[PDB]
Amino acid sequence: GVTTFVALYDYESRTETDLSFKKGERLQILNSSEGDWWLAHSLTTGQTGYIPSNYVAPSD
């Protein structure tokens, strides 16, 4: 059970709860893919936080 995505663009953390990531990073969500902001964990960096769905695309 995973739901994974790859980053299309860099995203710099700007809030207390979001997650910085670089283009090409692999990210997994910790709940469902509903909505526009998802709690994620980066397989690349090990960090976690909310990410914007419009910066990523599904990755098997």
Which stretches within 1-60 are classed as H helix? Answer: none
Q: Tell me the domain boundaries of the chain.
A: 1-60
Helix-strand-coil split of the chain, %, nearest 5:
5, 40, 55
Cα separation, 33 vs 15, in Å, equals 21
Cα separation, 12 vs 2, in Å, equals 24
In degrees, rounded to 5, the angle at the alpha carbon of residue 56 between the alpha carbons of residues 20 and 60 is: 115
Q: Which two tokens stand for residue 53?
A: 């769905």
57, β-bridge pairs: 6
56-58 and 37-42 beta bridge pairing: unpaired
37-42 and 4-7 beta bridge pairing: unpaired
- CB-CB contact of 30 with 39 (8 Å): yes
Cα separation, 10 vs 54, in Å, equals 12
Secondary structure of residue 24 in the 3-state scheme: coil
